[PDB]
Design a protein around this ligand. Sequence first.
Ligand SMILES: *[C@@H]1O[C@H](CO)[C@@H](O)[C@H](O)[C@H]1NC(C)=O
Lengths: 48, 48
Amino acid sequence: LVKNKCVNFNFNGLTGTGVLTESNKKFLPFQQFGRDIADTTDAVRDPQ
Amino acid sequence: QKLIANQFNSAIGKIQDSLSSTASALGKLQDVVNQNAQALNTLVKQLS
Ligand SMILES: *[C@@H]1O[C@H](CO)[C@@H](O)[C@H](O)[C@H]1NC(C)=O
């Protein structure tokens, strides 16, 4: 993966484009994705 | 003159206290923001 650069990612079947950034603020116990009020992905966890 | 001066000062203090205490006086300004937010949220949710 490459960070802080507009890429076309693909994480375990979810697609889209964005600027991947370090997100240590978010805590995920076992969950994979993330979501917002309008049901949009704002955070993912790296499978590797 | 002194009577009107005192009455005006007391009225100003009273309205300041009323604004500080009660919270439902500004509905005419909050409802516009709520309506706009709901409209945008519905427009975004229509994507799915
Ligand atoms: C995946 O393999 C790498 C290779 O060293 C290792 O560092 C990492 O801990 C592994 N992660 C999982 C979830 O298997």
